[PDB]
Amino acid sequence: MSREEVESLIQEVLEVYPEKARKDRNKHLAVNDPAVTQSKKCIISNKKSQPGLMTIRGCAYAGSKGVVWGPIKDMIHISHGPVGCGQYSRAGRRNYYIGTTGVNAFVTMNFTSDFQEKDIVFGGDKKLAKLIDEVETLFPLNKGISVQSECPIGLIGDDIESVSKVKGAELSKTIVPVRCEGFRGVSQSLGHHIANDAVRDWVLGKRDEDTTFASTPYDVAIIGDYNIGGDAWSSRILLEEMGLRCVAQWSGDGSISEIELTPKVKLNLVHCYRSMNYISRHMEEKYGIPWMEYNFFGPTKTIESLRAIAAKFDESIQKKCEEVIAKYKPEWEAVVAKYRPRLEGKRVMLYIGGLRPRHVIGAYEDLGMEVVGTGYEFAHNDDYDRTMKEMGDSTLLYDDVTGYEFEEFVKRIKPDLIGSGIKEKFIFQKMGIPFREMHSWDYSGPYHGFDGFAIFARDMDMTLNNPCWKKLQAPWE
Amino acid sequence: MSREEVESLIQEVLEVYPEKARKDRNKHLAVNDPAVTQSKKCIISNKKSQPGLMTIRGCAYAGSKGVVWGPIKDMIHISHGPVGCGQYSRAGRRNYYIGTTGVNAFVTMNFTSDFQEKDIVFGGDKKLAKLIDEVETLFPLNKGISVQSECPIGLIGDDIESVSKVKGAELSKTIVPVRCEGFRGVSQSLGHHIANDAVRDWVLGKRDEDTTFASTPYDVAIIGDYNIGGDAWSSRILLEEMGLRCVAQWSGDGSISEIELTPKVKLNLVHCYRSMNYISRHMEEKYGIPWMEYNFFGPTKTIESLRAIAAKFDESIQKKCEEVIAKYKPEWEAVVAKYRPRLEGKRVMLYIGGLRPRHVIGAYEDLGMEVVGTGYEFAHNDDYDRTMKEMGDSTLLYDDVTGYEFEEFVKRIKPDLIGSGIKEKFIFQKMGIPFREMHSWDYSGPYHGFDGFAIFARDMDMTLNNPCWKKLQAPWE
Amino acid sequence: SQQVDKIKASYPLFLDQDYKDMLAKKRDGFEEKYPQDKIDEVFQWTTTKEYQELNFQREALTVNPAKACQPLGAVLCALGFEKTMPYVHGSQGCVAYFRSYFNRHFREPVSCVSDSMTEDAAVFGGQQNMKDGLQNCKATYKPDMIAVSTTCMAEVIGDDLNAFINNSKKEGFIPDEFPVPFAHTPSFVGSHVTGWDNMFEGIARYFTLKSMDDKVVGSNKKINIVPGFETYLGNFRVIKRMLSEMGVGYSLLSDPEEVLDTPADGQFRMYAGGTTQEEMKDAPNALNTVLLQPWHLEKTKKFVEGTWKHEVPKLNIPMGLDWTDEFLMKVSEISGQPIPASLTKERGRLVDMMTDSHTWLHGKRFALWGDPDFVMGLVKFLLELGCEPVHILCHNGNKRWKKAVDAILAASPYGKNATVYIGKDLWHLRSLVFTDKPDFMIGNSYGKFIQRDTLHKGKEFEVPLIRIGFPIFDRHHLHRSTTLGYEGAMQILTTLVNSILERLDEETRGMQATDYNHDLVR
Amino acid sequence: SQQVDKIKASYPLFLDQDYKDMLAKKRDGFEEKYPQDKIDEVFQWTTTKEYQELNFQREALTVNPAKACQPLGAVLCALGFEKTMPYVHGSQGCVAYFRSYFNRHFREPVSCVSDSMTEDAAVFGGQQNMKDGLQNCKATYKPDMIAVSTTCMAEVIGDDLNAFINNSKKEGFIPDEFPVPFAHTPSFVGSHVTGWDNMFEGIARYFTLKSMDDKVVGSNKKINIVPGFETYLGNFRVIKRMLSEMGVGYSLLSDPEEVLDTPADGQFRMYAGGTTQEEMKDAPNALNTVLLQPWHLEKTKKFVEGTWKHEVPKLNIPMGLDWTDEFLMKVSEISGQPIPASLTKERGRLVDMMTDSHTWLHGKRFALWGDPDFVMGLVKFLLELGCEPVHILCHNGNKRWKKAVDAILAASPYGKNATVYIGKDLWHLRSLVFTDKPDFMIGNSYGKFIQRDTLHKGKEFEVPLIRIGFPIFDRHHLHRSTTLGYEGAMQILTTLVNSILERLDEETRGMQATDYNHDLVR
Ligand code: CLF
Ligand code: CLF
Ligand SMILES: [Ca+2]
Ligand SMILES: [Ca+2]
C-alpha cells in the first residue's frame, strides 16, 4: 500500500471522532520510515488513554502483580483490596514454574484481603497484619510476602509500608509493600516501574554484605523473561550449552533467592527492555554490572544474540557458541524447509504490549512472512526508536490503538494473519481472518529459542492454512 | 388378594386369546396351594411356546453357549453359523472370571464363523477346519475349543463331529462339537442338557485313567454357579472357611482342567439344579459321586446349607461350620437391623429362568418381604415341585408367561417391587413400579452368600424406597 | 466380610486380602494356568507388526465383529410405523436377543414377537406357526399392522412368506384387509442395515405397488425422507426440525422416535407415534424421495425410482458442514423453499466453533468404525476439522463404498495417512492401534476392550475411546444425542475437543512433574 | 531439541533429559529450595483435620475465592439490552479484566468501555471523564444506549453518577433524551451478582419511574422474566422455548443470547438482539414479573413490587423436577394458559431418565459451589436423584439463604450428612474434600486445582471435578449447555451418571486385576 494511501486511511478512520479525541489519536498513528532514528518525530506514546474509546490496555496492578511479581514462585503475593482484581488475574498468564503448589510455590493461587465496606471506611491495615499471621500459619514454607495494592489502598490513606516494616521485623521475613494501585500511571507500564523500585528497595540489597556465594566469570542473569509456556527454559538451555551459568531468571520460574543473588553476576541479559530496564540501570549504577539487550525469537535473531553475548566473554565461550549454532542448524533448517513454503509472502498485523510487537518480526521473516502493521499498548518512545528499523518502509504503526481503529485498519489492509490478545481474537475470527494469540501463545509454546521456533512455525501454519477459513460464506449466500 | 380373586384374575386375562392359545395358557397359570406335593396337579411346564404371544424365552444356543460353555475361561467358544447370535450374546451375561483377555482367557470375546451364502449352500465344515487353524495360530494359549452350533448347522447337514475328531487328533487338542441349534427344544433348557452331554462325551472322561491328582476327604465341586457378579467367589470363600477344598466351579470362573478334575471329588454341591442335574446324575452313576442341592441366598438358607453340607463330612468340618456361622452372624444381623425395617411387609413379584424364582424367596423373607407371585421361563415340573412349599398359599404361579399376562397380573396385584429381566425392566418402571434385574443383578452383586446378602439388601432398598417413584404423576395431571 | 455402613459390591470387594488369597489358591491348585511370564510374552507378541500380518491373513475366523444380522434392522424399521408389531417368522431365540440388544441401547421397552418355530417346523415348514401366530398376535397385542421378517432357520428351509401370509388370510386367521407387509431377511447376507432396507422396501411395495395408476409425482408438494437404520433420537428430531424451519412439507417414512422415548407417567405404551399407513399409501405423490443413508438403501432406491418414478438425488448423509450444506441446497431446489435465516445463522455458529477449537483438533489422529454412511460422514467431518482419520473400518462395507471414501480422502491433505478397511473386525483394528497408534478411537462400546488392551502395554500406549455409534451400553442416555446436521456437528466437535482436553489434563495433573502445563485456560 | 515431524510443545518437551537436568541444576544451584521430605511433610499436614481447624479460623485472609466483583455483573446485565454499550466509570484496568474474563468463558467478543480515570481524577473527581467518555463512546461505537456502572476508585472518591450524567447532557456532550441509565456498583459490597441486580434496577427505574401514571397491570397480557446473572446460553433459550410452547406472552428483560453467539460469517457484529427500550418502557403493563434467580434480585424485587405494583411470586430457580413443575404451574396461573402436552411429556421423559439411572446415582456424595440460586437448585436436584450434597459452599451466600438451604436439606433423608458454608472459599473446600472425602466435586474450572491436590495424596483420594458453573475456561463450548428446566435437568443427570461410569471404567480397566468388573453393559 503506498505511503499516501496509508496516510489517507489514517485520516479516514479519524473522521469518526469528536475533535478533542481526533486531535489526540492523530498523534498515535503513523506510517513507518526506517531512516528515522528519533521516533518522536513520527509518533507519541505513553500518554493517557482517551475516555470511552475501548483501549486494550490494563492498569498498574496488572503490570506489577500480574507481570513482575506474580511469577516469583516461592513468595505469596497478596491482592490487597476488594475481590475482583485477584480473581480476574488468577492463572490468566502462563508464567510457568516448577513447584508444589500450595506447599512451597504459590503462583496460580489467589490470595486476597477481600475488602468489605468496613475496611474501606476504617482502613485495612489491621486486617493486613492479621492476614500476614494467617499466611504464616497456613503456608509455613513461603519465603516472603508481597502486598500488591489495588485502587482503594492509597485512596483511603492506608499505610502498608508501616505494616510491612513492623510485621517483617516481628517475623524475620521479607514483606514487600507495592503501591501499584490501578489509578496510577496510564497503563501496565508504570506498574513495571513501581514493581522494579519495590524489588530494589526491599529485596535486591539483602545480600550486599554477604561474601559466601561462589562466583565464576561466566555468571549471568536472564532479566525480563516471564517464561510464557516455558520460554525462559528454552532460552536458558542455550546459554548454558554455550558455557554460561544462569544464576537468575527474572521473573519466570523465579525464586526470591535468585533475585537476591543477581547482584553477584557478571552480565545482565535483558530480553524485555520495557519491563526491566529500570532495575538493570540500577544494577549498573550501584554494582557496576553491565547489561545488554538480546532477542531469542527465531534463528536469525537467536544466532545473532548468542554471538553478541559470547563476545562479552573469552574465546572459550565463543567456541562453545559456534558449537551450539552448529548443533541446532539442521533443526531449524528443517523447520524452515517444511513451513516457509507454506507461509511465504503472507502478511501479518500485530498488536501486543511493550516488547513483542518488534521482537517477533525476525521470526516471521525467517518464515518468509511480512509484518505490515505493528503497535503497542503501552510502549514508550524508546521502544518505537527500536521498532522503526525493524519494520519496512510505509508500514503502519499504532500506539494504544482503539478497538474501532484496529478493526477499520484490518478491513482495509486485509492481512492474512493477526497476532494480538484475547480481547481481539474472537472479533477477527468472525471476519474470517486467521488469528494467533501473541501473549498466551494460544496455549502453546514455548516460542523462544531454537526449540520454540519449531513450535512457532507449526502454530502459524496450523492456523493460517486451516481448512476452516474457506467455510465462512454459505454456498447459497 | 384371596384365592378366588386370583382365580378370577387368571380367567379374566385369558379372555383375550383365541381358543387354542386360551386352552393352552390356562394350563400354565395357577394359584399356589402349599399342601400339594405333585406340581403337575396344578401347573404344566416345559412345553412349546404359543406363536405370536411374546414369550420371554430364548433358545438352545443361549442355554449352551450363553449359559454353560461360554463362562469356561481358558477355552475358545466358536459361535458357528451367521453373525447375529454371537454378537447379541457377547458380554451380556456377567459370568465373572480372572484372566488376561485375548491371551489366556476369552470369555468376553466373540469368535464366529460368520456364515455367508456360500457356506449355507455348500456347507461350513471346510470353513470350520480352516477357522480352527487360524485360532491355533493367533491364540496359542487356548486350552481347547468348543463349536456352538447356530440354527443353520443341522439344517444344511454339516458334520461338525467329524471335523472336531479329525482336527482334535491332528492338533492334540480338545475340540468339542455342540449341537445346540436354536430350533431344538422349546427354550434355553434343552441347551443345558445338550451342553451337559457334550461335557460328558468330550471332556469329562479325559483323566479317567490318571491317578496323579492327590485327593483329600474334603474335596467338593460347585456345580451350577455361573459366578454372576462374583456369586461363586462369595460362595467358595465360605466353603473353604468351613475346611472344604473346592476343586472345581461349574462354570463361572471355570477352567477346563477343573472340569477334568471333577470326577476326583467326594461330593458335588449343586446350586442350579435345572442346568446341571444331568451331569450330576451321570457322575453319581459312573463315578459313585453323591450330589446334593443347596441354597446360598440369604442368611437363613446359607446357614441351613452350610450345616447340611458339613454333616456329610466329619466332626472337624462340623466344628469349622459353626465357626463360620459365628463369624458372619454379627455381619448379617447388622444388615437385617438396617434394612428389614425399611422393607418389612413389601410385596414382590418375580419372573426369572429356571432356579432363582424359588431360590431367592428365603432372602426376601429374611428382609420381611413377601413374594406374592413367581414364575419361570423354562423350568420343568421338578422345579415347580420344589416351589409350591416355598411360596405362600393363594400366591400366583406362571409358567412361560406372556408379555400381556405379566402386565395384566401386575396391574391387578400392584406389587411394591418386581424382579425380572432386561426385556421387562423398562415396561414396569414406566408404570411406576420399582424394578430390580434378577438375572444381571442390575450390574451389582454378588448376591450369594453372607457378603452377597448385604449387597442384595442395599439394592432392594435403594430401588424400592427411591425418591423417583413419587414423581411420576404431574402435579397438574 | 462386609461393614454395614460401607457395603462393597464386586469391585472393590474381591480386592480384600481374603478373596485375593482364595483366588490365588484356586488358580495354583486347579486351573493349570500358563505361567505369568508366558502370558506376558504372548500379550507382547499380540501387539506386534508380525502378529498384525498373521491377523490380516485370516480367511475363515472372525473375532469381535462390528456388525449384526439382518432381522435386527427389519425390527427397527418396523418399529417406525404407527401401531405396528414387528414379527419375526422363525426361531424365538432371535427375538429375545433383538429385544435385549435394543433394550440395552435405548433403555426402553422393545416390542417384537416370534412364531416359535421349533424342530417340527424345521422339516415341514412354518405355515401353521404363521397362521396361529398372526391370529394370536393380532388378538393379544392389537396392532394395526404386523410387519413380517425372517430368522435364518426360515430362510434355510425356504418358507414362502407371501404364500404363508396369503393362506393365513384365505383360512380366516386374520382379516383379508389387515396389513401384513413382509421381507425375507437372511442373516447370512449383508448385515443389520440390509435388513432395514429389505423391510422398508417390503412395506413400501405393500402399500403402493398395486395402486400406482392414480399417482402423480409432485401432487402432494412434499418430500419423502427415508432415514435408514438410525439409533440416535436426535437424528430423527433434527431432520424434522430443519425441514419445518424451512417450511418444507415432508413425510418421514419409518419414524420410531416416539416409541423409543415414551414418558414414565404411570402407564406403559406399547405403541406411540410412527409413520401412518396413509403416509405410505400417499408417498408416490411426493415431489421426490431423499435417502439419508444411501449406502444401505439401495433396494429401496430401485423401488422408489422404478415404481414411484422419483428422481432420487445423489446426496451423502447430512453429516458435517459441506454435506449438511448440500442437503439443504438440494431440499431447497426440490421444494422451492429458500434456506431461511435461522439455518444460515446456525451454520455460522458451527463455523465459529470450528474457528474456536481448531488449534486443539489440528493433526489429531483417529481410528473409527461403524456402518458405511455414518463412517464416511465422520471421516468427512474429521477432514473439515483438520484431523487425520488414520484407520477407517467398516466391517459391513463394500468395494464401491470403499472407492467413494478413498476419493473423499484424496480431496484433502488431511487424508494422506488414512486407510479404509472393509471386511475387517475389531480384532484387526486392535492390531492397527498398536502398530500405528492414533490419539483416540471413535466407536461403540466394544471399543472399551481395545482401550483396556492398549493400557495394559502401558499408559503411554493407551488409546482412549470416544463413544459415538451403536450400540452404546456402558453410558446412559447417549442415544438422545445428535450426529446429523449442524446440531450434530456441534455436538461431535464439542465431544472431540473436550476428549482431547480431558486427556491433556490427565497427563498434566502430576504435581511438580507435569503440572507446569496444567493450565486454567485452554 | 526438536524432530521436525513430531514437534513437542511445553508438554512433553520439558520432560526430555536435557531439560530435566537443566531444571535440577537450577533448583540446586540457586533456588534455595526446601528439601523434598519437608515439602512432603507439609503437604501431608495440609490434608489433615488439624490443618482444617486452623484453616476454618481465618478472619482476614481469603485464598482462592469463589466470587467476583459487582461491575462484572453490571456489564453482563447491560449486554442484554439492544444496541447497548456497557460503560464502567472509573479505572480502565477493570474493563480489561471484565472483558477477558467473559471472552475466555464464552469464546466471543465482549464489548465494554471505560472512561479511564487516572490519578488526576482521584482527587478532583471524574466529571470530565464522563463528559468526554460519553461523547466519544457515542460517536465511535454508535450505541443506542449507554449503561453506566462504577469501579471501586469511583465509589471510594464518591463520584455522583446522576449529577455527572446530568451535567454531560446539560453541557451538550450527549443528547438530552439519549438513554444513560446508571448504577453504583461497589466491589467491596456483595459480589458480581449484586452488580447485576443493581444495574438491572437502574435500567428499570430509568425507563419507568417517571411514566407510571398511564400504566395498568395486566394490560399487555405478558409476563416479564428477569433472568439474573446467567452464563449458559441454553438457560435463556430454554425459558423462551417453554413459554412459547405454552402460548404465554413474555418479555425477557436482559437477553444477551444473540450477542454472546454471533455467527462467524465474515463480519463482526458488535451488537445483536437484546431487550428493546420499548419492552422496558412497557414492562409495568405486564401481568406480573417472575425473577428466575431471586436470591440475587432483591433490589429489583423491591422496585418491581413498590413501583410497578406487581405481586412477584415466591418461586425458587426453575432447576430440577419439583421447582420446574412449580414454575410452570405459577406461569399457568398468572397467564391462564394450561401446561401443554409437549411439556407434560418432556417432564415424563426426565422422570424416565431418573428411573433408568437411579441405581448408579444412589448415595453418591458431592462437594459443590457457585452462586446462591444455582447452588440451591443443584442441591435440590441432587436430593431428587437420591444423592448426598455433603459439602455445599457459597462464598457469596448470606445467612438468610443458608437457613433456606438448611430447610431444604431437612425435608429429605438425603440431606442428613450435608453442611452449608457461607463466606468460605476454595481453600476451605479443599480441606473438606480431604477430611470428609466425597465421590465428586461439581464446580467451575478453579476446582481442577483441588482435583490435582487430591490426586497427589493418592489415586484412592482423588476427587474428580464435574464442570458446572462459571467460569469454565479449560473446556470448550460448555457455555452452550442448559441447567434450567427439564432440559437442564436431563443434561445434568446425564453428565453426573456418565461421570460416575467413566470413573468406574477407569478403576476397572486393569487387566487381570480389576477388569473382572469392566462390564460391557451398565
Ligand atoms: S434361535 Fe442368529 S440371531 Fe437369529 S437370524 Fe440367525 S444369525 Fe440372526 Fe438361537 S441359534 Fe441363533 S439366536 Fe436365533 S439364529 Fe438360532
Ligand atoms: S484498575 Fe478490582 S476489578 Fe476493578 S472494581 Fe475494583 S475490585 Fe473490581 Fe487495576 S487495581 Fe484492580 S483491576 Fe481495576 S480495581 Fe484498580
Ligand atoms: Ca428409559
Ligand atoms: Ca466463539
B142: domain CATH number?
3.40.50.1980
Assess whether A14 and A140 both reside in one domain: no
Q: Does domain C215-319 have CATH number 3.20.20.70?
A: no
Distance A86 CA to ligand 2 centre (A): 9
Catalytic residue among C88, C110, C113, C152: C152
Q: Residue D181 has which C-alpha cell?
A: 441509565
Q: A379 and A271 in one domain?
A: no
Residues near D124 by Cβ (< 8 Å), separated by ≥ 6? none
* A79 φ/ψ angles, rounded to the nearest 5 degrees: -85, 105
Distance CA A248, CA D162 (A): 53
| Neighbour order of strands in the sheet with B76-80 | B175-178, B145-149, B76-80, B111-112, C62-63
Do residues A98 and A214 share a domain? Answer: no
- For residue D481, give the C-alpha cell: 449447555
CB-based contact D512 B94, cutoff 8 Å: no
> Would you kindly state where each structural domain of chain C is located, as residue ranges?
69-214, 215-319, 320-363+484-522, 364-469
* Residue finishing a domain among B202, B220, B254: B202
**What is the residue range of A290's domain?**
203-317
Residues of chain D contacting residue A182, judged by C-beta atoms under 8 Å apart: 91, 93-94, 153
Ligand nearest to the CA of B116: 1
**Domain C364-469, CATH:** 3.40.50.1980
Q: How far apart are CA A374 and CA A380, in angstroms?
A: 14
Ligand 1 near B116 CB (within 6 A) = no
A neighbours by CB contacts (3+ pairs under 8 Å): C, D
Q: Which residues of B are catalytic?
A: 59, 62, 93, 192
For residues A274 and A298, membership in a common domain is answered with yes
Considering the domain architecture, whether residues B100 and B64 belong to the same structural domain is answered as: yes
Residue from the list D386, D516, D522 with its beta carbon closest to the beta carbon of B97: D516
Q: Is C354 in the pocket of ligand 1 (CB under 6 A)?
A: no
- The reply to whether B334 touches chain D by the CB within 8 Å rule is no
Q: Tell me which chain D residues have a C-beta less than 8 angstroms from the C-beta of B464.
A: none
| Residue ending a domain, choose from B202, B235, B261 | B202
What separation, in Å, do the N-terminal and C-terminal C-alpha atoms of chain B show? 29
Say how many C-beta atoms besides its own lie within 10 A of residue C158's C-beta. 7
What is the number of the ligand closest to the CA of C480? 3
Residue B327 maps to a domain: no
Does domain D69-214 match CATH 3.40.50.1980? yes
Nearest-CB residue to D115 (from A51, A92, A473) = A51
H or E stretch including C120? helix C119-124
Let me know whether B171 and B266 are in one domain. Answer: no
Categorise residue C391: left if φ over 0, alpha if ψ from -120 to 50, beta otherwise.
Answer: beta
* Distance (Å) from CA B85 to ligand 3 centroid: 25
- Specify the length of chain C in residues: 522
Residue B325 lies in a domain: no
Resolution in A: 1.2
Q: How far is D225 from chain A (nearest CA, A)?
A: 28
**C320-363+484-522 is classed in which CATH architecture?**
Up-down Bundle (1.20)
Q: Is the peptide bond before B434 cis (omega within 30 degrees of 0)?
A: no
Cell output for D216: 395498568
DSSP one-letter string for B363-389: HHHHTT-EEEEEEESS--HHHHHHHTT
Residue B332 forms part of a structural domain: no
Would you say D151 and A151 are in contact if contact means Cβ atoms under 8 Å apart? yes
Degrees, nearest 5: CA angle C501-C505-C509:
175
Between residues 61 and 100 of chain A, which touch chain D (CB distance below 8 Å)? Answer: 61-62, 74, 81-90, 92, 96, 98, 100
Helical H runs in C341-468? 341-361, 372-384, 399-410, 426-435, 448-457
User: Which residue in the set B334, B403, B455 is minimally distant from C9, CB to CB?
Assistant: B455
Read off the C-alpha cell for A374.
Answer: 505493528
Alpha-carbon D212 to chain mean position: 33
**B-contacting chains (≥3 CB pairs under 8 Å):** C, D
Q: Are residues A182 and A303 in the same domain?
A: no
Q: Which residues have CB under 8 Å from D170's CB, separation 6+? A: none
Cβ under 8 Å to D: A residues 383-422: 402-404, 407, 422
Q: How far is residue A460's CA from residue D180's CA, in Å, rounded to a whole number?
A: 43
A–D: how many Cβ contacts below 8 A? 319
Only one residue has cell 565461550, namely A317
Which DSSP category does D274 fall into?
Answer: -
Is residue A332, in this structure, part of any structural domain at all? no
- Whether B332 and B398 have beta carbons less than 8 Å apart is answered as no
What does the alpha-carbon distance between residue A139 and residue D43 come to, in Å, rounded to a whole number? 10
CA dihedral angle for residue D117, residue D121, residue D125, residue D128, rounded to 10 degrees: -70
- How far, in Å, CA of B410 to CA of C393, rounded? 46
Residue type, D179: P
CA B85 to centroid of chain Cα atoms: 19
Q: Is residue B365 part of a domain?
A: yes
**C-alpha span between A113 and A181 (Å, rounded):** 15
Task: Tell me whether the omega of the peptide bond preceding residue B446 falls within 30 degrees of 0, making it cis.
Answer: yes
Q: Is any atom of ligand 1 closer than 6 Å to the C-beta of B150?
A: yes
Picking from A20, A90, A255, the nearest residue to D132 by CB comes out as A20
Q: Same domain, yes or no, for B458 and B350?
A: yes
Please report whether residue A397 resides in a domain.
yes
* Chain C residue numbers touching A97 (CB-CB < 8 A): 516
Q: Is D137 a catalytic residue?
A: no
In this structure, are residues A443 and D476 in contact, taking their beta carbons and an 8 Å threshold?
Answer: no
Distance B41 CA to ligand 3 centre (A): 41
**Structural domain contains residue A335:** no
* Sheet architecture: strand order including A111-112: A175-178, A145-149, A76-80, A111-112, D62-63
User: Exposed (0-12), middle (13-18) or buried (19+): which is A460, by Cβ within 10 Å?
Assistant: buried
3-state secondary structure chain A: CCHHHHHHHHHHHHCCCCHHHHHHHHCCEEECCCCCCCHHHCCCCCCCCCCCCCCCCCCHHHHHHHHHHCCCCCCEEEEECCCHHHHHCCCCCCECCCCCECCCECCCCCEECCCCHHHHHHCCHHHHHHHHHHHHHHCCCCCCEEEEECCHHHHCCCCHHHHHHHHHHHHCCCEEEECCCCCCCCCHHHHHHHHHHHHHHHHHCCCCCCCCCCCCCCEEEEEEECCECCHHHHHHHHHHHCCCEEEEEEECCCCHHHHHHHHHCCEEEECCHHHHHHHHHHHHHHHCCCEEECCCCCHHHHHHHHHHHHCCCCHHHHHHHHHHHHHHHHHHHHHHHHHHHHHCCCEEEECECCCHHHHCHHHHHCCCCEEEEEEECCCCHHHHHHHCCCCCCCCEEEECCCHHHHHHHHHHHCCCEEEECHHHHHHHHHCCCCEEECCCHHHCCCCCHHHHHHHHHHHHHHHHCCHHHHCCCCCCC
Residues A37, A49, single domain; the answer is yes
Domains D69-214 and D320-363+484-522 are alike in CATH topology: no
Which of B110, B113, B149, B150 is the best mutation target for the ligand 1 pocket, counting ligand atoms within 8 Å of the beta carbon and taking the most?
A: B150
Q: What share of chain C is helix, strand, coil (3-state, %, to 5)?
A: 55, 10, 35
Q: Do A and D touch (≥3 CB pairs < 8 Å)?
A: yes
For chain B, how many structural domains are there in total? 3
Residue that finishes a domain, picked among A202, A231, A246: A202
C217 assigned to active site:
no
Q: Compute the distance between CA of residue C391 and CA of residue C379 in angstroms, rounded to an integer.
A: 10
Nearest to B152 by CA among B89, B86, B88, B82: B82
Q: Do B92 and D521 touch (CB under 8 A)?
A: yes
Chain-chain contact of C46 with B102 (C-beta, under 8 angstroms): yes
Asked whether B and C share 3 or more beta-carbon pairs under 8 angstroms, the answer is yes
- Residue with CA at minimum distance from ligand 2 atom 5: D151
Experimentally, the structure was elucidated by X-ray
The reply to whether A330 falls in a domain is: no
Give the H/E segment covering residue D51: helix D49-55
Q: Are residues B76 and B188 in the same domain?
A: yes
Binding annotation of D for [8Fe-7S] cluster:
69, 94, 152, 187
- Show residues of chain D in contact with B463, CB under 8 Å: 358-359
β-strands D62-63, C440-443 pairing: unpaired
Rg over CA atoms, chain D? 26
* CA distances (Å), origin C453, targets A250, C394, C439, C459, D129: 47, 21, 15, 11, 66
- CA-to-CA distance for B154 and C156, rounded, in angstroms? 11
